[PDB]
Structure formats: C-alpha cells, structure tokens
Design an enzyme around this catalytic site. Structure first.
Site, short mmCIF file in Angstrom:
data_model
loop_
_atom_site.label_atom_id
_atom_site.label_comp_id
_atom_site.label_asym_id
_atom_site.label_seq_id
_atom_site.Cartn_x
_atom_site.Cartn_y
_atom_site.Cartn_z
N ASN A 46 4.40 -23.61 9.70
CA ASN A 46 3.85 -22.64 10.67
C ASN A 46 4.64 -22.61 12.00
O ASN A 46 4.15 -22.02 12.97
CB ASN A 46 2.37 -22.89 10.97
CG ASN A 46 1.53 -23.43 9.83
OD1 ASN A 46 0.92 -24.50 9.94
ND2 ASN A 46 1.50 -22.73 8.70
N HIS A 53 5.33 -25.03 14.09
CA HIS A 53 4.82 -25.95 15.09
C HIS A 53 5.59 -27.26 14.95
O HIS A 53 6.05 -27.59 13.85
CB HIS A 53 3.32 -26.20 14.89
CG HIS A 53 2.48 -24.99 15.15
ND1 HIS A 53 2.25 -24.53 16.43
CD2 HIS A 53 1.90 -24.14 14.27
CE1 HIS A 53 1.54 -23.43 16.30
NE2 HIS A 53 1.31 -23.15 15.01
N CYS A 58 3.85 -29.53 21.95
CA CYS A 58 5.18 -29.23 22.47
C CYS A 58 5.67 -28.02 21.65
O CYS A 58 5.57 -28.00 20.42
CB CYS A 58 6.12 -30.44 22.33
SG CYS A 58 7.89 -30.06 22.43
#
Ligand SMILES: COc1ccc(NC(=O)CN)cc1
Ligand SMILES: COc1ccc(NC(=O)CN)cc1
Lengths: 264, 265
Positions: free
Chosen positions: B186, B188, B223
C-alpha cells in the site's frame, strides 16, 4: 532445493511472501534478485563450496560479480510459487558465469531468466587475477561440459556494452547510504542493494504505469558501509533508461546500467 | 503454514536464507520481525481477512501497530528452521493484541517470543478510535476465549512505560530515508524498517561484542516515503541498555521511541 539428476544444475521453489511484494501486488525485482542469490548459494553449498575452492582459500582469492543481467516476463503475486533452476559455467581464463531460469511452478512456463559474469579477485589487494588452470579443473566437475546458456541468441541484450551517463542527469536520487540490513555476513554491501539504488532515480510515475522488463548492471567498484551514493538516470528511448551510481563526494563510479520498461 | 487443530492459532516453518543473516552468521532481528509479520499475514488470510473485517472496510477502518515487543534467546544460523506460532486476542475497546512464540523446529525449544498492540484508526483522517461491539464480535470467533499470553509474567518488560530521550543524544544516525524496498503493497513504510532505523544509531562495537536480547518499540506516527528520519540513542545502563528516539529530520516530530537490551556474547 536439490541438485538435478545429472548433478550439473540446482532447483529450488519459493513461495512469495507478503513483505516481498511492491505497490502492484507483485514481487519486487530486488526480491527476485535475492532469490537468484539464495539459489546460487544453495547450489554452491550442495557441491561442497563455502563459492571459494580449496586453491582459492590458500591463495586468498574470491569470485566477485562484474555483471548482472535479468529479464522478467511476469512478476509473481503474494502466495505464488517461483521455481528457479541455476547452473555455472567456466569462461576460460576470463572468469565464470552463473545462469538462471525462472518458472511458474504451477504452469511450468518460463517467467524470467538471468545471467551473471564473475571475475577472480584477491580479497586483500582487490586486484583481478585471471583464472588459473588449477582452479578451472576444480570448477569443471560441477559445470555442464557443452555450453548451456540462459541467453543463447547471437547479439543479445546481456552482452551489450554500456556507456557512461553524461552530466547533467535527467533524474537523480542523492545521499543514498546502506544500513545494517543491506550488509551480507562478511559486512560487504549486498549486490541487490545496488539494484535498488539504481531504481531509486526512476520517477514514481514510470513505476506506477510501467513494469521492469530488463535490467543490465555493471559492477566497477564496491561501496563501503560508510560510503554515500548518488543515483543518476537519463531516458534514452517501451521506456529505456541509462543509469549511473557514483560516490557522493569525489564522483567515483561504482556502477553503470540500463533498464527497459513495458507499459502495463 | 497452517491453523492448529482448534483453529485458534497458526503455525509456519521458515528455513533461514543466506541473505537473511548478519555479521554473526545468524538471522538479523529485522529478518525475525519480517517472519513474525509474514506468519501474522498468513494467519489473517487463512481465516478470511484482507486484517480488516467486513465492518472495518465499510467504515474505512484499519488496524495499526502501537507497540512491538520482541525477546530473542537464540538467533538461527543460515539453513536453520524456525517454527513460529501466532494468535490474536481482543483487549476490549482498547484494541487487539497479536502474540508469537518462536521455536527451533529441530529441538522444539523456545528460542524467542513477541507481543504487539494494535489500535483502530480511520484510514483517511488518521484518527484513532475505540473498538466497536460489532467489530469485537467479528474477530472473537478467531481468538482464544481464555487469556493466552506470550508474556504472562506480572512486571514483564512488554508493558513498561518508555520515556522521551533528552537532547543531546549520546549516539546518532542522521538523514535516514526509505527506499522502494522499504515500502509495503500500500506504499506505506514497513514497520520493520523503523526497527532497522532505531538500531542504526547503536555503535558498531556494541553490535560486534553483544547480541540483541530485547527490543520494545512504540509507534507514534507514520514516516512517509518522502520523509527523512534521525535516529538517536543514549546508554541507560554484563548487559547493555539503551533508550531510543526516531524523529523527523526537519521539525523534530517524534515518530518512535524505544528501549533495547543487549547481552555480552
Ligand atoms: C575493478 O574490478 C572490480 C571491482 C569490484 C567489482 N564488484 C564489486 O565489488 C561489487 N560487489 C567488480 C570488478
Ligand atoms: C496517531 O496514532 C498512531 C499513528 C500511527 C501509528 N502507527 C503506525 O503508523 C505504524 N506504521 C500508531 C498510532
């Protein structure tokens, strides 16, 4: 994993892991490259290597990658099974070659292929030494005697001369550093990390709309764990790119390469 | 991998790979953390998840890691087989917990254990929320009803409050950035990358003379792929203990805090 019936090649199956896949739900080229490296190590272990021979350990000699060439026709998704066959071949006094064939374990179809050139080096002085007669004999009992090529075609992409990227680069990713996960058991940067660094300067839009079909990478120098790398890319065209990895400070070349991407 | 006989936990075996090992000829803690994550994903898939439930997908809700706690007694070498058992448990409206037991597949002995706390978050707004009754009922059919804890002990290390590191840090690793390999499906940053970033500020001499026994990590913020991180460490202590902080390079916004315990080789 196991050596085949004739003992001149090695096969292994891998089930693709959740953390091994990228944004397009398929295995990254870095996961593929790590799998090739794993099956190569398992082939070396199965026939009695460390892939240093007895003569090489006495003389402080190691095999180092000079070139890696990978062609992928289809990327496997999470849960898919990839079967990899690998073998080695002597190339006279120049060095050795390791080849791979990737297949979908379920259908048996070829989904990719790879070839790599290895040169002999003194591990302390870092000087290339040309293969000796004694070392060749120790390696030939584990290699097919007739030529067996993953890229047989006369005039193929795997043996193409790669030019040096001219400044200014069209795209760049600067200040790349290895972390402890990027280092192997001997504290050297893993060869797969350089592939990731090359690909960091490809823009995200190309990654989102294209798939990587071919990557050819020349290894000129090692990057140390305290070195910083700059990744440079220029479009030369399918989409084609010319690549350069160099040390951030002095601009010393560590790698050069080319990539070919197909529209999804 | 497979669910156990009662269907309330999941087991899987992994043969340690050549590229998965560090300088000590043993699997890195990041390889271990990736294996825990893999067996957790395979457990979710085996019982019909993708680990959002039907109600969570309707309301744009996801499970996010708030804390990860790992204790390793022995690291496996290249070629060794690690067996991992994993299960989940509801913790009322606070969230869920995933636990792991690591064993040497050959001897059957416990070589490690892990626990993690997960909180519910709306995917878009990033706002945490308590677990609703409808969600709770949907995952309780896949969880043991009696408590089953990888860290059962009363004053165990897994539930300890972690303080905020005070500037100046004793050690630091500056300008850490994720690359495409550090991103999940995804886009991330993978939770395991934060563990690697925390460990980047431990000096090489400690890594060369000690082995990591315990790591507790709090996740405060995510982050982004275009963010830059600074990793900070201070010795707090045979054994060596450290206090850790990950913050954004610019504004100094906290992303993680943690503690590590290392034992002399
Ligand atoms: C000057 O000759 C060479 C020096 C280094 C390499 N490759 C690497 O060190 C990359 N792993 C190849 C040839
Ligand atoms: C606002 O509260 C939180 C935000 C993020 C996390 N965790 C992660 O994003 C882990 N990648 C946990 C709590």
């Amino acid at each position: 994993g196991s050596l085949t019936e004739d003992g001149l090649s090695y096969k292994e199956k891998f089930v693709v892991r959740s953390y091994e896949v990228g944004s397009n739900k398929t295995a990254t080229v870095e996961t593929i490259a790590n799998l090739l490296q794993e099956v190569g190590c398992n082939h070396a272990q199965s026939v009695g290597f460390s892939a240093t021979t007895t003569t090489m350990r006495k003389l402080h000699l190691i095999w180092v990658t000079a070139r890696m060439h990978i062609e992928i026709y289809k990327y496997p998704a999470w849960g898919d099974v990839v079967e990899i066959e690998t073998w080695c071949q002597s190339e006279g006094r120049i060095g050795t070659r390791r080849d791979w064939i990737l297949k979908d374990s379920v259908t048996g179809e070829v989904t990719g292929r790879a070839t790599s050139k290895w040169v002999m080096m003194n591990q302390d002085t870092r000087r290339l030494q040309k293969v000796s007669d004694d070392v060749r004999d120790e390696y030939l009992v584990f290699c097919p005697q007739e030529p067996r090529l993953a890229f047989p075609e006369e005039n193929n992409r795997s043996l193409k001369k790669i030019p040096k990227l001219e400044d200014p680069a069209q795209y760049s990713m600067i200040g790349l550093k290895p972390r402890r996960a990027d280092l192997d058991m001997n504290q050297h940067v893993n060869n797969v990390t350089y592939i990731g660094w090359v690909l960091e300067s490809i823009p995200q839009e190309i990654v989102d709309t294209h798939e990587l079909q071919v990557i050819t990478l020349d290894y000129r120098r090692e990057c140390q764990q305290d070195d910083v790398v700059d990744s440079l890319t220029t479009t030369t065209s399918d989409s084609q790119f010319l690549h350069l990895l160099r040390l951030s400070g002095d601009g010393q070349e560590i790698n050069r390469g080319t990539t070919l991407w197909r529209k999804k």
